[PDB]
Amino acid sequence: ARIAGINIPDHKHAVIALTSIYGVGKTRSKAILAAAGIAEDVKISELSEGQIDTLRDEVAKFVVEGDLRREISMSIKRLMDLGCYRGLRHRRGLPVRGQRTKTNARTRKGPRK
Amino acid sequence: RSLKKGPFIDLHLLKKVEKAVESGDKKPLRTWSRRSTIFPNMIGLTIAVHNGRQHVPVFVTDEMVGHKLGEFAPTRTYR
Amino acid sequence: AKLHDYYKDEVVKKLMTEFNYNSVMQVPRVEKITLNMGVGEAIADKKLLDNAAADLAAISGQKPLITKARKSVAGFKIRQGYPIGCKVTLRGERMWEFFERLITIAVPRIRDFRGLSAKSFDGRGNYSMGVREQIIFPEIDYDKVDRVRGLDITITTTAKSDEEGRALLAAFDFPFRK
RNA sequence: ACGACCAGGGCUACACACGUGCUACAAUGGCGCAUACAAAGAGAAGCGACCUCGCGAGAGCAAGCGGACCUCAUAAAGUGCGUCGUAGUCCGGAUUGGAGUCUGCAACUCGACUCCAUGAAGUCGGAAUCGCUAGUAAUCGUGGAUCAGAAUGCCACGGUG
RNA sequence: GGGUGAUUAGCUCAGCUGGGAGAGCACCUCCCUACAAGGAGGGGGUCGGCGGUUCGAUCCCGUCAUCACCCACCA
RNA sequence: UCCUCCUAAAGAGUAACGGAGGAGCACGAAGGUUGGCUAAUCCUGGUCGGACAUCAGGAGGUUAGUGCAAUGGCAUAAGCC
Structure with missing residues (x-):
């Protein structure tokens, strides 16, 4: 467990093994392999055969975790006190692309009793 | 989302922008339109927007260009 | 080992140019680094402390020993010197041994940061660096990440003011900025 | 005047649940590649071929057709190889950031289309409930209307059965 | 004036060698059909206030606030 | 019944239903010892996070502790190891 990053899956497909850890997109998770000659097939579970111990800096040399969060939060850097639409909708946990709040809202605040 | 290389401002506003200081x-x-956007060419001008109840002055700076008057005189409240 | 050798030649031995002394022996020195790792949700049994200290001793050069409590901690049944955590305090060569592993090889869990402040204060010049976890060192196989465990760091020095300790802050490669 | 001319709002605002439509939780599966067997209909500021460009949406050169002409448009399930094998999964993508496309006097709010990067739920379902008697129930494909620009709702026709 | 005992889910109340809270009945949402009823699913605690003993106190100790009850006791 | 201060007179006992509070059991350890060791409280600063909360540095000092209420020795520690 926790061999590709912060996420717990034991046995995972190699072309998406760097997903769900805040540092790699779906196509990048396959492109990062072919720049190093790494295999694009068969699921991985350990640090064998150079299949992922070769990818530690190639992920970290870009925006990752809080640095990625800060970059996708550039949208509101002029709205960190000014509430105009996106401002207030980020200063509290709120929708920014429309929400039909009278249904389909559990996911915004917490699960039903 | 495609607005580039020049401001979209009408000729009645251009008669004012030349003498904005x-x-x-x-x-x-005094403006009734709210779909309208603020641009660098407009900096220095004073503007008041109808909030659907009264006209209010809106404070404009070069930091907030590319936003609409409906973001300062808010559209369908909501919080 | 190179960073303690840099401390023996490149740090404060010319400080008389900037700070007033009656002897060149007054220039500031590092005394200790105390450290801390918190037992968290295991506090009511804490027989795992021997097994948690053994993995702090996997990046530290010291032999593990267990922190005794002070003034008790909450209502968790803590009495007198009850074993409650780990410090495994660093002195001498062991301080810079650790600061040649910290953010040199132990890296895969660091947070977004680029430089800690130099103009920070306490009244003596005793600096701190926020890390929250033991941030993991890479092995040939791991199979080592489940919870990683905590880390806290504040140095102790012979300095008498925050700007005198700012000259002793030169003793490390950790990102600090003026 | 509550008019309707004009610049503009709201009718896609949620203190909470259900109905409708729908997809996954799959292995009697899904994806890519190949390939068998279609009906029906719409189509002159339309459908737009070949060909070019644009990761693509779309744009350009430009044939024919006004009806059995030429175009939308090689129908998809089905079959065959590979591959997954309880893994909160190649699955599934709410949330969401950027960059392009398109209509329009104007699209952020309350539009569509495309390409990236980021990513939660879903491992099975309570008291209960519904539809068909045969090419029917099952279940995947394909059109039509409205219309500057945009339907998953409405109507309509095939495949296996 | 003197005294006994309590204060925890809306209400009834559990939980004292001193170990970070639980049931019944309501209620709330849903199912059945429209409420009564029947069924199913779900919920959150100023566990009186301030001091003292203690590692830890609603829980042991003091003292005030409150309630219900007892009582105003010889000639 | 035992046990403690003040009142209680610079020898000494001491009244009051005077001012005020406890014990009725524990501890193989806190017992024996050679050696080694040295707070409280207030303040500054905290972390993924707090109903409670880390280890340092600054002030300070027979102000912590001693199985238990109460007082006083106490580092030669009689305090803990």
Whole structure:
């Protein structure tokens, strides 16, 4: 467990093994392999055969975790006190692309009793 | 989302933008349109927007260009 | 080992140019680094402390020993010197041994940061660096990440003011900025 | 005047649940590649071929057709190889950031289309409930209307059965 | 004036060698059909206030606030 | 019944239903010892996070502790190891 990053899956497909850890997109998770000659097939579970111990800096040399969060939060850097639409909708946990709040809202605040 | 290389401002506003630094003497531009955007060429001008109840002055700086008057006189409240 | 050798030649031995002394022996020195790792949700049994200290001793050069409590901690049944955590305090060569592993090889869990402040204060010049976890060192196989465990760091020095300790802050490669 | 001319709002605002439509939780599966067997209909500021460009949406050169002409448009399930094998999964993508496309006097709010990067739920379902008697129930494909620009709702026709 | 005992889910109340809270009945949402009823699913605690003993106190100790009850006791 | 201060007179006992509070059991350890060791409280600063909360540095000092209420020795520690 926790061999590709912060996420717990034991046995995972190699072309998406760097997903769900805040540092790699779906196509990048396959492109990062072919720049190093790494295999694009068969699921991985350990640090064998150079299949992922070769990818530690190639992920970290870009925006990752809080640095990625800060970059996708550039949208509101002029709205960190000014509430105009996106401002207030980020200063509290709120929708920014429309929400039909009278249904389909559990996911915004917490699960039903 | 495609707006580039020049501001989308009407000719009735261009008659004002040429003489906008007189806004220590001249009173705010009374506007009813809210779909309208703020641009760098407009900096120095004073503007007042109808909030659907009254006209209110809106404070403009070069930091907030590319936003709409409906973001300062808010559309369908909501919080 | 190179960073303690840099401390023996490149740090404060010319400080008389900037700070007033009656002897060149007054220039500031590092005394200790105390450290801390918190037992968290295991406090009511804490027989795992021997097994948690053994993995702090996997990046530290010291032999593990267990922190005794002070003034008790909450209502968790803590009495007198009850074993409650780990410090495994660093002195001498062991201080810079650790600061040649910290953010040199132990890296895969660091947070977004680029430089800690130099103009920070306490009244003596005793600096701190926020890390929250033991941030993991890479092995040939791991199979080592489940919870990683905590880390806290504040140095102790012979300095008498925050700007005198700012000259002793030169003793490390950790990102600090003026 | 509550008019309707004009610049503009709201009718896609949620203190909470259900109905409708729908997809996954799959292995009697899904994806890519190949390939068998279609009906029906719409189509002159339309459908737009070949060909070019644009990761693509779309744009350009430009044939024919006004009806059995030429175009939308090689129908998809089905079959065959590979591959997954309880893994909160190649699955599934709410949330969401950027960059392009398109209509329009104007699209952020309350539009569509495309390409990236980021990513939660879903491992099975309570008291209960519904539809068909045969090419029917099952279940995947394909059109039509409205219309500057945009339907998953409405109507309509095939495949296996 | 003197005294006994309590204060925890809306209400009834559990939980004292001193170990970070639980049931019944309501209620709330849903199912059945429209409420009564029947069924199913779900919920959150100023566990009186301030001091003292203690590692830890609603829980042991003091003292005030409150309630219900007892009582105003010889000639 | 035992046990403690003040009142209680610079020898000494000491009244009051005077001012005020406890014990009625524990501890193989806190017992024996050679050696080694040295707070409280207030303040500054905290972390993924707090109903409670880390280890340092600054002030300070027979102000912590001693199985238990109460007082006083106490580092030669009689305090803990």
